[PDB]
Amino acid sequence: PEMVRGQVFDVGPRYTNLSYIGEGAYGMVCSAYDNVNKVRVAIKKISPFEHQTYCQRTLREIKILLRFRHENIIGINDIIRAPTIEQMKDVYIVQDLMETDLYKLLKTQHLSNDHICYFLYQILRGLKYIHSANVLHRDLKPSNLLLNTTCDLKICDFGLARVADPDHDHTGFLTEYVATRWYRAPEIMLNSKGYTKSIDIWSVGCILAEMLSNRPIFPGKHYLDQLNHILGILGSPSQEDLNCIINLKARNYLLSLPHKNKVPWNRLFPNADSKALDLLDKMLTFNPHKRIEVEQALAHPYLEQYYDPSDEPIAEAPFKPKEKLKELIFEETARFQPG
Numbered sequence: 001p002e003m004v005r006g007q008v009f010d011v012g013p014r015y016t017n018l019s020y021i022g023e024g025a026y027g028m029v030c031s032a033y034d035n036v037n038k039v040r041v042a043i044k045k046i047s048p049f050e051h052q053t054y055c056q057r058t059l060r061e062i063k064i065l066l067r068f069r070h071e072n073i074i075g076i077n078d079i080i081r082a083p084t085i086e087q088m089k090d091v092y093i094v095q096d097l098m099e100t101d102l103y104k105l106l107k108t109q110h111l112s113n114d115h116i117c118y119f120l121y122q123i124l125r126g127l128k129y130i131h132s133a134n135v136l137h138r139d140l141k142p143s144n145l146l147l148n149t150t151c152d153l154k155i156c157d158f159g160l161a162r163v164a165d166p167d168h169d170h171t172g173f174l175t176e177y178v179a180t181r182w183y184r185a186p187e188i189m190l191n192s193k194g195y196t197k198s199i200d201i202w203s204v205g206c207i208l209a210e211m212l213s214n215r216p217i218f219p220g221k222h223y224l225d226q227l228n229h230i231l232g233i234l235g236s237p238s239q240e241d242l243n244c245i246i247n248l249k250a251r252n253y254l255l256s257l258p259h260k261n262k263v264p265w266n267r268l269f270p271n272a273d274s275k276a277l278d279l280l281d282k283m284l285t286f287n288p289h290k291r292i293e294v295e296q297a298l299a300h301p302y303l304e305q306y307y308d309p310s311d312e313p314i315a316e317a318p319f320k321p322k323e324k325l326k327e328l329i330f331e332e333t334a335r336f337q338p339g
């Protein structure tokens with residue numbers, strides 16, 4: 001069994017010449033040479049079977065990624081595991097190799113307006129498909145946007161994804177959430193479980209703002225500090241937007257704050273395209289009911305050079321204990337086995 005930085009990374013004779021790429025969620029990511037297709041590929045190692053939550057997220061992602069087929073969503077090319085449930089300890093998922101990701105790119109490279117436009121188009125085109133399947137990604141952020149050497153973009157990491165459930169979205173104030181802090185919509189901290197498509201649009205808005213300046217727009221240091229940052233830029237919500245928050249703890253928290261003026265987008269982003277800032281404003285709307293939807297964002301003047309709904313496909317249908325989850329992961333990966 002081949003080893004990378006101390007641990008087994010045992011991907012049969014098909015995949016050879018491994019190089020470390022970085023850490024994943026339940027194991028490391030390597031590139032390898034695929035001896036069948038004659039290309040380097042990415043392989044992530046997953047060791048989820050001790051835990052309910054790890055099994056859950058591994059299984060959720062495999063089921064989603066095998067059902068989805070879209071140019072802006074990372075696919076699964078192969079899955080490696082032992083031939084029996086008893087022998088199966090790790091699972092390896094083989095995917096297209098992508099040079100970089102948007103997090104790495106933003107740390108090192110200024111983006112032209114033409115690159116920002118293209119990246120945002122491809123994000124929204126992929127998101128149209130995800131939302132058309134009644135699925136929410138729920139952790140969109142730069143590190144989850146893979147890019148290749150020609151700037152093709154693919155959304156990855158469906159481990160926090162959920163089927164949309166707007167009728168069960170309401171919750172109380174300061175209810176814990178799992179998804180990445182800087183890209184969390186204000187309502188998560190106020191009255192939302194993150195069960196609507198509007199959650200993902202907020203994240204895309206944050207990504208757009210970050211593409212404009214190379215800096216996260218709302219770099220909170222902790223749960224309610226995230227809301228401090230958002231209100232610092234958007235300013236105090238209007239009476240109408242406040243009246244939408246029926247929960248009294250959440251409403252009265254907002255009422256307790258001193259008045260904060262909106263910071264104009266063109267003062268934060270003096271070099272940005274004005275059409276990009278109009279779209280940014282519509283994605284970073286406080287009230288999730290007023291927030292632009294993915295198909296409307298694609299139709300925004302900023303993206304007019306690329307917008308083509310006939311070339312922005314949708315999904316053919318809506319998407320629908322640890323021992324049982326190991327069995328389910330085993331059954332779900334069976335199609336990749338020899339015989």
Ligand SMILES: *CCS(=O)(=O)Nc1ccc2[nH]ncc2c1
Binds near residue numbers: 023025029099144156
């Ligand atoms: C969402 C990215 S990851 O954490 O799953 N790691 C990863 C997957 C697939 C890739 N293809 N090229 C690079 C990577 C990284």
